[PDB]
A paper describes a structure:
The Escherichia coli acriflavine resistance protein D (AcrD) is an efflux pump that belongs to the resistance-nodulation-cell division (RND) superfamily. Within the HAE-RND class of membrane proteins, AcrD is distinct in that it is a specific aminoglycoside efflux pump that mediates resistance to a variety of aminoglycoside drugs, including amikacin, gentamicin, neomycin, kanamycin, and tobramycin. It works in conjunction with the AcrA periplasmic membrane fusion protein and the TolC outer membrane channel to eliminate aminoglycosides and minimize the toxicity of these drugs.
A detailed inspection of the structure indicates that the three protomers present three different conformations, which can be classified as “binding,” “extrusion,” and “resting” states, based on detailed structural features of these protomers. Therefore, the apo-AcrD trimer presents a very distinct conformation compared with other structures of asymmetric RND pumps found in E. coli AcrB, P. aeruginosa MexB, N. gonorrhoeae MtrD, A. buamannii AdeB, and A. baumannii AdeJ, where the structures of these multidrug efflux pumps showed that the three protomers present “access,” “binding,” and “extrusion” conformational states with two periplasmic clefts open and one cleft closed.
Numbering used by the authors:
A (entry chain A): 989 to 1031
B (entry chain C): 100 to 247
C (entry chain A): 1 to 198
D (entry chain A): 248 to 396
E (entry chain A): 446 to 494
F (entry chain A): 545 to 939
G (entry chain B): 51 to 149
H (entry chain C): 742 to 791
The structure:
């Protein structure tokens, strides 16, 4: 967003975009791995 | 308690002018406090260098005020009073020089005051003024020798 | 709970309608602003001694006020300054969450005790206790295009005819003026006074 | 014409004889200037609990009403305004909300590909928004930059 | 709902001006989350059925 | 594990702020002439500044509203404040006409003016918030040594702070001492001549200083009445001798017979903090140095000062001192609550660990994005980080 | 010493100015007298806390004390919650007539 | 008024004005010396001016 | 009648009701809202209870049958549309919906 | 003008038979006395104002 209030809008947009991309890319793989490990060990 | 203090202060403000002028100069205080002291602190000079009056003056000057602003302290009364330039008149000497106590009081009032003189070049000022510096008149006396 | 509303769509619709109606009423009712009140309540005590010095002002006004600002609730710290202009400001910063109305009321109540102790000129000028959390919406400047009105004339006209009607608007809380209204000025002449033994 | 004293000869000493009397300003310290021309300012401060945009609009409208009686030459100029910024902020926030709802519709029809299934979330978000606004009003909150974000 | 509340609630208890700034977001987001969860268990099943 | 380490590294590299700066549509320029300067010279400097604004940054400015006689650091004849208003965001370019670019050019332009310290700045969103690097300290005088001793201690402390590399841009917010005139009224001589000291004081107060004598009504409104000397008769130290005071007999006694004037030095503004004579020494922590470390360094420096001079932190520094690492404790409690709720949901003590390990997965991307774009760790970033954490946890 | 018109122009109107726009303020009634006493009655919305209203008025009154004339400030401005609920009106009379 | 003034200033203390003591504004009091305000006959020591 | 009379005065003079007159005007203004909101709430509650949009609609058609009788009784007795009549029409609405 | 309007309105209300006891709550205008002191003559005679 270019204009009035561009600072906070840029901050929230960049943070949310990066976080959501990283989460939706990494979790869909790592969460099954964590679940499989913890269920294998049964701690 | 805040509501009670507000109501009392609202009622009290009506009669502050009705009180004697000396009372007003001393000032009336409304405090939301009881009478029991939660803690009583005693200040004692171990070396004996500070006299009892010196201890009282130091406490009332440097300690009573900061402790009075501690949150929760409704009031803090002092069992000692700060220093004061005590002047002990002598009736025989006053009669010798044909002066009343009012003469002494008026002389002290006139010769010991903070005057607000002004500035060298306050607004509005003449065109092309070099500087604007404050002007200090006679100030409050400090040592008892000055009062003598 | 979900199975309860699956068989009863009308109940869910009624609840949704109630929520939507209440939300619409709230939207119409709630205020709108840039930022809310996000600051510890700071209260400023301003006293004016015309022609005074910094030392004189501190001796006769600042210290007197400080010594009587006791018993305040949730007082973080006290800051004061005495300027050579003739204005003494005492700032009382309270803890976050303190009621600003209660804070200013307490500060005013404490000040009333020390009002008589102040010099007569300071009392006449008036000592005002106001919050420092003022947010200026507009800063409107009045300029004379023709040049007929001088700066003093403009300031007096604003203070006389403009500051009143604008201060009656519902949303207005305070109207600061950056000009000085007309006042009768007498300019003494030492030679003339000495000539007439005055 | 204030009489300081009256001489025994009938002559009088007036205030004008020993001083110059003019109607000036009480405080000469301030020299406010606007765009190179002398001017005087008037800062209006919001009262808590009211819309700053509506308050500014009402103040400007009233001053426009007062502008009809201004003496010739005098004009009011706005040298500082916060209405534009807050209006732009609100417009951007509501635009982002509506665009987010539209994109929810688009993605829902992209994946599920059912119009009614697409409507199902399109009607569930607004009721939650209304509930949130109701809760904010109940708590005494208001539409701020922070709350809108 | 519970874990999300635990994510957003603690920022409300921070002190000072920054604490109030965080509290605004915390209260808004928690209210929205609770309302959505209530709507998710009440309104959405009725619409889907 | 490598992702977690990179997350830690990126978090360490991220600068911290409280609120981003936005193009609010206007900025503020301040002027401060050297002490002991009339308002005519300040007006001249303000005219120069506004000529610069109307000349170079003409395409973006809309109106500049100066105010001589008041501004930062306290009102005075050498302090001016200017409100510069800019056009609509669309009209000015979003590349070279942004508020930040305008002030960047102005600061370069304003630093070439040797007459006065004119600095342009953008108003903060909230006055309470301050830059994270900056801090406020109040060097107090607990022993009552005097104003001169306090100023000497302030100078020494400023020198020490300038020496330290961990402290950057350390200065006092007060006004340096300026020459003043001291009138010496010979009480004995005045009384020998027959003059009354009260009359002398009244003449000085209502002649050089103003005198709000009474009120008068003008066009249906009450206005003040002031009595003061004419401008040419209250300018120079020799103007004192022009006045005459009347003795008991009625004759006029010249002011030069019982008065003498000398030049001394006094502070234009005297400041007190918590009832103690203090000077507000404001400084900024050096980059790469913790604010707490900077405060500890300043405290050590104050310790190096002669006894009787304490220090007290104010505003943001005091708030930071009070709120000591509350966020780690609050979020540890939050993590424990999350673990308990997940254990209850999954009816196991091990399964909840699977969910909790996904928190770093979503934060590293947000950190990387906010670092690459050059943004900082503002509160908005905190909220966005929490939201992405919540969504990843839900998934 | 102020005339009724002078009192209205210089005191009552000024007092109205700042106090206009208070929270839950239905209407203001002002009464300027020829003896020199000025009265301003604020009728807040029903259900408002009278003590909160008084505190709010007092806080807002400090913003207009300067604008008031010096004599008015010296006399002092009183803010008191006022009604007209005469519960009782006892009349004291002497039967004998001695008093 | 004169005899009252010399009687509430000699016997009773009189808050005349203030003075500076190591950076504080302490009060100034005028009162008779202790030996001259002890006995009830100490009033006869005082003189007023006609 | 008073408002009609105040319009015969020279132009520029207006009127404003205060105290009980102001409260009565507020009542008169807010009446229709109160009825509409009360009717809507009753309809929504009945729809929620019986899980239909037809049962509450059929029930709500009987409110006029009671309101007409309340109005006729008030008109015949000579009473007025006071606050009591308003809290009375609400009771009649409830009773008719009950039947 | 306000007093004249008030009097006209009261006369109209008195004419109307559907209104009774219509009155002006305040006080009507009353005569006042002005004491003019010639400061010049007071000074000439020697009496302080």
């Amino acid at each position: 967003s270019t204009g009035a209030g561009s600072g906070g809008q840029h901050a929230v947009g960049t943070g949310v975009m990066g976080g959501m991309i990283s989460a939706t890319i990494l979790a869909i793989y790592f969460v099954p791995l964590f679940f499989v490990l913890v269920r294998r060990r049964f701690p | 308690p805040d509501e009670a203090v507000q109501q009392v202060q609202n009622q009290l403000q009506s009669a502050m002018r009705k009180l004697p002028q000396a009372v007003q100069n001393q000032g009336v205080t409304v405090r939301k406090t009881g009478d029991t002291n939660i803690l009583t602190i005693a200040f004692v000079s171990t070396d004996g260098s500070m006299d009892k009056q010196d201890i009282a003056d130091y406490v009332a000057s440097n300690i009573q005020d900061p402790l009075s602003r501690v949150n929760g302290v409704g009031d803090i009364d002092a069992y000692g009073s700060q220093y004061s330039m005590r002047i002990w008149l002598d009736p025989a000497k006053l009669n010798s020089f044909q002066m009343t106590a009012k003469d002494v009081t008026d002389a002290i009032e006139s010769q010991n005051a903070q005057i607000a003189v002004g500035q060298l070049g306050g607004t509005p000022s003449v065109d092309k003024q070099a500087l604007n510096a404050t002007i200090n008149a006679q100030s409050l006396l400090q040592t008892p020798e000055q009062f003598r | 709970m979900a199975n309860f509303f699956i068989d009863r769509p009308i109940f869910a619709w009624v609840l949704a309608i109630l929520l939507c109606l209440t939300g619409t009423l709230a939207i119409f009712s709630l205020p709108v602003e840039q930022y809310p009140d996000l600051a510890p309540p700071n209260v400023r005590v301003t006293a004016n001694y015309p022609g005074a010095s910094a030392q004189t002002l501190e001796n006769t006004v600042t210290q007197v006020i400080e010594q009587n600002m006791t018993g305040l609730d949730n007082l973080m710290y006290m800051s004061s300054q005495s300027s050579g202009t003739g204005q003494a400001s005492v700032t009382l910063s309270f803890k976050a969450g303190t009621d600003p109305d209660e804070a200013v009321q307490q500060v005013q109540n404490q000040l009333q005790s020390a009002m008589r102790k102040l010099p007569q000129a300071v009392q006449n000028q008036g000592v005002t206790v106001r919050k420092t959390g003022d947010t200026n919406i507009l800063t409107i400047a009045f300029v004379s295009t023709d040049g007929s009105m001088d700066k003093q004339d403009i300031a007096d006209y604003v203070a006389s005819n403009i500051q009143d009607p604008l201060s009656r608007v519902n949303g207005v809380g305070d109207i600061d003026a950056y000009g000085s209204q007309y006042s009768m000025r007498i300019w003494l002449d030492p030679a003339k006074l000495n000539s007439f033994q005055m | 014409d204030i009489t300081l004293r009256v001489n025994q000869d009938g002559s009088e000493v007036r205030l004008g004889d020993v001083a110059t009397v003019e109607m000036g300003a009480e405080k000469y310290d301030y020299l406010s200037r606007f765009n190179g021309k002398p001017a005087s300012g008037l800062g209006v401060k919001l009262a808590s609990g009211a819309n700053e945009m509506a308050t500014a609009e009402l103040v400007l409208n009233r001053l426009d009403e007062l502008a009809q009686y201004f003496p010739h030459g005098l004009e009011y100029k706005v040298a500082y305004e916060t209405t534009s910024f807050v209006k732009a902020s609100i417009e951007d926030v509501v635009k982002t909300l509506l665009e987010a709802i539209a994109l929810v519709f688009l993605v829902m029809y992209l994946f599920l590909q059912n119009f009614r299934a697409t409507l199902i979330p399109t009607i569930a978000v607004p009721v939650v928004l209304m509930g949130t606004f109701s809760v904010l009003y109940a708590f005494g909150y208001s539409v701020n930059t922070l709350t809108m974000f | 709902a519970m874990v999300l509340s635990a994510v957003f609630v603690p920022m409300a208890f921070f002190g000072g001006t920054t604490g109030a700034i965080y509290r605004q977001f915390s209260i808004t987001i928690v209210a929205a989350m609770v309302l959505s969860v209530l709507v998710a268990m009440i309104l959405t099943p009725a619409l889907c059925a | 594990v490598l992702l977690l380490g990179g997350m830690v590294f990126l978090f360490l590299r991220l600068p911290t702020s409280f609120l981003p700066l936005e193009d609010r549509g206007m900025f503020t320029t301040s002027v401060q002439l050297p002490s002991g300067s009339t308002q005519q010279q300040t007006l001249k400097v303000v005219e120069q500044i506004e000529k610069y604004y109307f000349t170079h940054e003409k395409d973006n400015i809309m109106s500049v509203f100066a105010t001589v006689g008041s501004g930062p650091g306290g009102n005075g004849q050498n302090v001016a404040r200017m409100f510069i208003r800019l056009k609509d965001w669309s009209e000015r370019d979003s590349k070279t006409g942004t508020s930040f670019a305008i002030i960047e050019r102005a600061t370069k332009a304003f630093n070439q003016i040797k007459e006065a310290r004119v600095i342009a700045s953008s108003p903060p969103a909230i006055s309470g918030l301050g830059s994270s690097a900056g801090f406020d300290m109040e060097l107090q005088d607990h022993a009552g040594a005097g104003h001169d001793a306090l100023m000497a201690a302030r100078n020494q402390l400023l020198a020490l702070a300038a020496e330290n590399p961990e402290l950057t841009r350390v200065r006092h917010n007060g006004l340096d001492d300026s020459p003043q005139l001291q009138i010496d009224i010979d009480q004995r001589k005045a009384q020998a001549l027959g003059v009354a000291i009260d009359d002398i004081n009244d003449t000085l107060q209502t002649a050089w200083g103003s005198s709000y004598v009474n009120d008068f009504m003008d066009r249906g409104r009450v206005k003040k009445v002031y009595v003061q000397a004419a401008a040419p008769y209250r300018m120079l130290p020799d103007d004192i001798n022009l006045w005459y005071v009347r003795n008991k007999d009625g004759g006029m006694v010249p002011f030069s017979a019982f008065a003498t004037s000398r030049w001394e030095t006094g502070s234009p503004r005297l400041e007190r903090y918590n009832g103690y004579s203090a000077v507000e020494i404001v400084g900024e922590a050096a980059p790469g140095v913790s604010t707490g470390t900077a405060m500890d360094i300043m405290e050590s420096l104050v310790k190096q000062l002669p006894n009787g001079f304490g220090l007290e932190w104010t505003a943001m520094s005091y708030q930071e001192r009070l709120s000591g690492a509350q966020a780690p404790a609050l979020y540890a409690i939050s993590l424990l609550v999350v673990f308990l709720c997940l254990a209850a949901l999954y009816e196991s003590w091990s399964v909840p660990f699977s969910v909790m390990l996904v928190v770093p997965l979503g934060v590293i991307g947000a950190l990387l994005a906010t670092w690459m774009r050059g943004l900082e760790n503002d509160v908005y970033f905190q909220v966005g980080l929490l939201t992405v954490i919540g969504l990843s946890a839900k998934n």
